[PDB]
Amino acid sequence: KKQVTDLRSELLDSRFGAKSISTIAESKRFPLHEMRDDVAFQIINDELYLDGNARQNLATFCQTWDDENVHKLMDLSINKNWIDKEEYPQSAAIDLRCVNMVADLWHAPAPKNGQAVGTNTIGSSEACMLGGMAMKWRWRKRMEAAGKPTDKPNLVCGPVQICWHKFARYWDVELREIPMRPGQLFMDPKRMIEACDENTIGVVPTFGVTYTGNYEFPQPLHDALDKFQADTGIDIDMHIDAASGGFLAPFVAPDIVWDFRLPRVKSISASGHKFGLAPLGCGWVIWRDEEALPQELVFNVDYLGGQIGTFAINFSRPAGQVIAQYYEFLRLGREGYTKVQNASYQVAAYLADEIAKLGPYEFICTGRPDEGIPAVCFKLKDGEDPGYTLYDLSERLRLRGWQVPAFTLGGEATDIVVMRIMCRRGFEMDFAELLLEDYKASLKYLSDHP
Amino acid sequence: KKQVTDLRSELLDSRFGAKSISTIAESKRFPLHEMRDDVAFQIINDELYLDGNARQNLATFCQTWDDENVHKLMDLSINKNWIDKEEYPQSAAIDLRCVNMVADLWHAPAPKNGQAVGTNTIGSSEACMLGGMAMKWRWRKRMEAAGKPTDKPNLVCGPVQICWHKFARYWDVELREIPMRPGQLFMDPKRMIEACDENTIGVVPTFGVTYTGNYEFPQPLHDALDKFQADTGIDIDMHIDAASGGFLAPFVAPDIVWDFRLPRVKSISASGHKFGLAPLGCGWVIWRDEEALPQELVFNVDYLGGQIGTFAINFSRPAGQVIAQYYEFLRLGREGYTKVQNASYQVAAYLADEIAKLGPYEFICTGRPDEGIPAVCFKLKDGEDPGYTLYDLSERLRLRGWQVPAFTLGGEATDIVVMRIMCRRGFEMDFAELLLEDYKASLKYLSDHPKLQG
Amino acid sequence: KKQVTDLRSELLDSRFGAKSISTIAESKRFPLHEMRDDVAFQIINDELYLDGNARQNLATFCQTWDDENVHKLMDLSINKNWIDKEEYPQSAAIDLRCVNMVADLWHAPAPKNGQAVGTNTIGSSEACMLGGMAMKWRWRKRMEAAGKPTDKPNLVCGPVQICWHKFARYWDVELREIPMRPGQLFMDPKRMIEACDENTIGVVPTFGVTYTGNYEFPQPLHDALDKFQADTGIDIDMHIDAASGGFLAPFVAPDIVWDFRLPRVKSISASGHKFGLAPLGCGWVIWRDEEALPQELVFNVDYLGGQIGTFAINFSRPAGQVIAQYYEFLRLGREGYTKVQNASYQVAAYLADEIAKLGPYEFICTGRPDEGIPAVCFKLKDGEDPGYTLYDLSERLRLRGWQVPAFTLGGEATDIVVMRIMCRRGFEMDFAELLLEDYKASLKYLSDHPKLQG
Amino acid sequence: KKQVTDLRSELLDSRFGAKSISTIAESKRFPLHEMRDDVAFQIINDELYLDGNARQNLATFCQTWDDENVHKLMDLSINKNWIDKEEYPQSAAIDLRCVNMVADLWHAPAPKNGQAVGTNTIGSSEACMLGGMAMKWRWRKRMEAAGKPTDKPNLVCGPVQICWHKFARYWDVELREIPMRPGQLFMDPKRMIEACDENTIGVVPTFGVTYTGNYEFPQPLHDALDKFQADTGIDIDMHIDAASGGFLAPFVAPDIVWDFRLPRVKSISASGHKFGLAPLGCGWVIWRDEEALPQELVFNVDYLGGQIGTFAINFSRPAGQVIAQYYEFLRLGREGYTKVQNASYQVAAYLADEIAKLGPYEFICTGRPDEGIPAVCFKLKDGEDPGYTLYDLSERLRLRGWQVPAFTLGGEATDIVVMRIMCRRGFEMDFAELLLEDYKASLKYLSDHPKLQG
Ligand SMILES: *Cc1c(COP(=O)(O)O)cnc(C)c1O
Ligand SMILES: *Cc1c(COP(=O)(O)O)cnc(C)c1O
Ligand SMILES: *Cc1c(COP(=O)(O)O)cnc(C)c1O
Ligand SMILES: *Cc1c(COP(=O)(O)O)cnc(C)c1O
């Protein structure tokens, strides 16, 4: 009668008084028995509190807030498979409208057949990899036409995000990164050209450098590639990594010439889940036209009496993010995106101005729309010692729940330490004012505790 | 006044009487102005009905239902970034626990340092590419150890899913796919050996072929690779693509030796969102140990005072799916998964038995746990003409919302047409009985209208 | 022009693109204009994230989790007024049942008229003040029965919670607080008697000391008061402040004689929202009988053709907490409470055991049901220097969201520094294991960074 | 087999078919066993229907409705502790903002340090007690400076709410209440002065008398006190009990000089949960400056590197109401509050006009913003006999679920019976029209049944 005794408790026991919640969760072997669903949920729900608060995570570029309709659309699409174009046909059609809209946003040549060349991805990483493969294949064909070897490809770039290093390693391409150096934390024309040769598959300007928040302007680089071809005969194209900038500049700094308005840009990628306002799991890559995308890389699938071209690394995945993306496009439009991005820039500019009053800092980024993304990036003025480092300050801020990263730059600037604050949607003026309060309090604490 | 009058309507108009819903949604250019959020949601919500009913989609292998707690965990984790190990450390800790559990499920050698070698992925596609890259690299090392050229790698396999064709194309590897042929819809030992040579980076058995639903058993192939090494000195590894079988066999057919219990299996991949019961966006790949994974492919990141290795093609992505996976592991356990998979096999066998009574069919898969996944796959018996093709039957069933695919096999079986029914979680016996009723009705309709044949 | 376009934006603008959310919230004067309700809610909701996580708050004794039915009862009762007995008759009746239940739990003499003498309160503070007032009044009557002056009352006690200092100040009573001494962090019989005299209105044993988590046992003190009356003729009563212990001992240590089983105990108070499992806003005070509560302090009100006495400092307040309490009483009962409290002690004992293996500590409280509440309290062994102070450790833990207090004891132990961990409902074993991991990581960091010392 | 059979039933039985719901709820002793949570919730949920529909309760002054955002905010803050300023620092910050806003609303001298002197409370009762203690303490210091006894304090007031009778009893203060009398149901200057002497700790004018709904105007009384000091040298201050009026006059009758604009007003208290639109559990008390609040009554606590003074009777309690109060302040502003209050006054004025047409009534309050609160209070004209009493009418209305109190006034007006209708937020015009319809029906019934009179 022991079995019956324990079963009775298993039925009537409360959530925290239950035997199944009296032990530490399994972390080594596959669990043997099934257990009360409420206890299983409670345990995991509580463990997740150790992740901290996403709204206070100021180190990330990804969306940490979504409105009610996106929550509903995501829940409604939880089981809609993005890859099954024939089984989820309307989801696929929506995806295609987004491709057209993004292509239009980036000034891609108007599609004669009514459909821009491009695709949704899980994020910029996959988007950049697809962009890199196409870049590699176009180069191979160029060299084959020239009768030259194709076994030593290289890629020229500036302070790229880690996905490009992974591309380099996984696709055996030599990465020629122009290192940052004091006063020049990016790839300038001169050093770019110095790294280019006939084995260069392309150049990748980062329209919104992660480490600094500033844009690498493609035009001056584009001018240098034109000169290079006129001098050497070598014709190099560009892929713009606009993970962040792709959904900012079009709305707040439309005159910046960085997209398909530039002849050598054959493809551009961006993260919908960054400033594109979509929930985690949405990326985009667009090609200027069909000739920029080698067909050998596209796998066609049947779609409504015909066949659509697919180019992806992943296969099955949720279609909720693209649906959410389309919702934002329709609900906000250019007008809405401008208002939302302007709100971010206002907050970045505010913090930039206020923080400048509190210490001997030299800013790298101050939330200016014509210079980069809505972020504040600074370092202590060389030789200035206020009695603390940005690492200590970063730590004091974390005591209040904020994640504000302090880190060293790369290349020839490794001796420089910077602090970066990202101002995304959902980091409203009032909320950022609280951060300013904790910053002042942290400084005051560091001054009284040397 | 016109302006204020229009604004008054914009504020007071009902959902369907509003001016903003009187037009066709944009599909060509980025929208110019903002609009009422309720109208935007409504328009899209309604368009999505044209996707049909996923619960009636019997063509997919992916989860079409999730319990309430998973819905809650997914909603709570909508903004948790899987890649940010330092910013979302407990999500990272949970993911690592799942790696251990899946590695354990597949009999991987127990990790001496407490952490198995492997990673979560968006799905089996990424998992397979990671496994494939590791294979190419290990092969290169093997060849370079003997001073031989590595310019012509090839991969030997059977009727694989399209992701392996993509792998071959993207990574410049020659795919040597042994084709299907009547009576042998898989990669048999004899033909496998024929295709293998010094340039083979590895063999990929499909533990659960999509086309037929049957398992390609790794053991007999393993025995062949042993003899192959004895005769030629060529040592070939295996990567098991257990996209479906990975979360089935361990529960309902433990006696099948297909995993790390086999020495040549250096890695295994499977889809959590298929029979792993996780929501779309979850896959797994495990390596038997440190030596099976080239560190040159791993990018280390800072994590709680130390470092964690990362091998992934994607970067930022939601952590909800892996959190949901862990919940299923904890809530169900071996006992629970066994009961859920048992229910699927019950239905598959029911339908296989019932449908057999309705026509001149030859079954390729009958939902037997010892032969493959919970699926029903059959063709019309050679030479018989019931007055209809499976294509016609498929179309009739679609009139009632069901998506039951009818298709021709590949290789040397391109003239054979099969119909496949997938029995996933959420396709309970009662629901399946309704399908059977529609099947019977479709058959009576086809018999009354002999012209539909063709 | 401007007014119209502005209103359009006000109507169509999204949450964060709205002009109204472009500024800092008002904090000095009453706002002049009305604003979008979604923006007002959003701003406040977001500000509240700076409060941190209540579940990781290990400093509080109050409930930080409530089940769904309680969330529902509270929402349904948001506007039910506890004081209006005639207007909310059944809420009143339920409250009265709770009084009988708590009185029963504490062994109060069975009430002849079917209703125990006592009342619900906002918390132990008001309850203690009511008990203190009755105490002062009974003392006055005793003194007046012999024609003696009542201008110099004093109250004898040990390491009491701040509410007794407030009672002493507000009601002009001299608080004779026996200070903590190393090895004697409580009011012992000998010192209690030294402080007692004819002007003592009562003795207040703290059955669950906040600073240490240990029980001050009323039995030994009661024996001392018996001897004291025998020796001096002075008869002194007790009021037990069982804010925490009143909802612990009855379930996990029934043999401790601390309640109305002791003749001199004329009243007992406790916090429902502490270990009574009620949501914030519920306290209790019970008197052993009619004679223990001076009628002059009670205000009778009409109630269903009759009258019931009321004794409270507050007037209008929500009835939800007492309704929630009754639900917990009925849903859990003695069996359920015993299981929830056992879970807390299990966790406290766990942490006590594991933390001991991490440093030169001397424990004051180790989560033993026979010595006190479910808490872990410790200090560094005298003379030992592990390279850090508990203050530094507390600070490191806060980096992970945990609020674990480190503070000096009072009295003659102001030189001692302790760290106290509260183990409440909702601080399950798995969650506590995460804290332990953070403790281990903090210690390693502190060992790698000596400068942090002090 | 019996134990297992009944267990199966406990699992499968429906809500009302379960054995656990087959008995009467416990009401005498602490429950022994734990029971199904759904049955426990159901039983209590159902018992609560016996309370009156709060929306139809026209006797209460407290909020009987709150918007959706307040419900959400309250649910989110169910466990935030108002007292732990250091553990819930932002909740504390928001509270202080409210203190500033309320002080500003009442014209308190602008705080030089940026923070007004005052505090949030559970309701007006605690606020008034805090206000009273401060008056008592200031008086004592005045007397001690004069070298006069402080053992016979008294307080002068008009028809105050019961909380002042409690203050008087609990703090041993002699209450000198000026009684109501025909013609003047309040404290007039002449009779106030006649009760004042050197032992008077202060005067408490009620800015919104509960019994009548009319305001007691502080100005003429303040004038009398100035003259009294000039004639006797006795300096007496005031504390305004603006429980209701505090959140009315500022918005709809700005010109009434009743607040800090008056020199003798050293403190004011009001109920946030009455016309302040906050949910039950919120009150306020503001002091004109630091000098008006004796420091010996404040207990300072650590707050963000500094210290914040606290003065409260309760300790732990929910922070949800203050957060909700701040939300209302921000969402409505002076514009929003004026609209909501104007709404109540329009409804009260409507009922007053309509009810006057139905019988021989003499109105004491007709919902005029310059005279008092949004209420209707009347009596039968002296001598007139319509064939019923207001008690009978009150009873007929209760048959329709309405709670409309009928009661006798106090003092020298005990022979006067009045009926009072409270028009709160949420008692919209349409709703009140239904009441008017029932009032007419009750009258027609009382006329058709003459023997009901009495
Ligand atoms: C964040 C980022 C990426 C990676 O994009 P995901 O969306 O995280 O995959 C790539 N490039 C740049 C410049 C980035 O900022
Ligand atoms: C479905 C499937 C895949 C692809 O897996 P995803 O989760 O869709 O990426 C790969 N291999 C096999 C055998 C499959 O069935
Ligand atoms: C917490 C506590 C109090 C105060 O009770 P509240 O519920 O916070 O008003 C009083 N006494 C003791 C011993 C306590 O622990
Ligand atoms: C209602 C009222 C009180 C009591 O205030 P609570 O908020 O109910 O505690 C005190 N004075 C007056 C004049 C009142 O109307």
Curated annotation (Swiss-Prot), chain A:
NCBIfam families: Glu-decarb-GAD (TIGR01788). Keywords: Acetylation, Cytoplasm, Decarboxylase, Lyase, Membrane, Pyridoxal phosphate. The lineage of its organism: Bacteria, Pseudomonadati, Pseudomonadota, Gammaproteobacteria, Enterobacterales. GO terms for biological process: glutamate catabolic process; intracellular pH elevation. Its EC number is 4.1.1.15. It is found in: Cytoplasm; Membrane. Induction: By acidic conditions. Expression is regulated by a complex system involving RpoS, cAMP, CRP, EvgAS, H-NS, GadE, GadW and GadX. The level of involvement for each regulator varies depending upon the growth phase and the medium. The keyword Nucleotide-binding does not apply. It catalyses: L-glutamate + H(+) = 4-aminobutanoate + CO2. GO terms for molecular function: glutamate decarboxylase activity; pyridoxal phosphate binding. The gene is gadB. Pyridoxal 5'-phosphate binds at S124, S125, T210, H273. Substrate binds at T60, N81. The keyword rRNA processing does not apply. PROSITE patterns: DDC_GAD_HDC_YDC. Changing Lys-274 to Ala increases thermal stability and protease resistance. The unfolding temperature is increased by 11 degrees Celsius. This is Glutamate decarboxylase beta. It is an enzyme of class 4 (lyase). CDD domains: DOPA_deC_like. Coiled coil: none annotated. Belongs to the group II decarboxylase family. GO terms for cellular component: cytosol; membrane.
